[PDB]
Write a structure and sequence with these properties.
Distance between the termini: 19 Å
Order of helices and strands: HHH
Subcellular location: Nucleus; Chromosome; Cytoplasm; Secreted
Radius of gyration: 9 Å
Keywords: V(D)J recombination, RAG, scid, RECOMBINATION-DNA complex
Shape: globular
Family: Belongs to the HMGB family.
PDB class: recombination/dna
Number of helices: 3
Largest sheet: none
Protein name: High mobility group protein B1
Helix content: 55-70%
DNA sequence: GATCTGGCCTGTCTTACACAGTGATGCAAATCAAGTGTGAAGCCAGACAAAAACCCG
């Protein structure tokens, strides 16, 4: 388990309740993990 | 005597005679680890209907 490991799923529902899909949901989550 | 020649001595020159196998490093490629809802390949439904292999009048 790494940062993105426990960051792609722990914050997954925060976009999965908006994005039905499951790449596009965590996609912008990767961008907000990269910005920081 | 004088020389010839033949035998022995080295002296070079030819082919040959044992290296891939050890443990280590160090990069490139693969995988894999989650996320989450998908569809796809079969599963099996008791019972029914078109073909290969061989019996049969």
């Amino acid at each position: 388990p790494s940062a993105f490991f426990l960051f792609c799923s722990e914050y997954r529902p925060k976009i999965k309740g908006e994005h039905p899909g499951i790449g596009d949901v965590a996609k912008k989550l990767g961008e907000m993990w990269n910005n920081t």
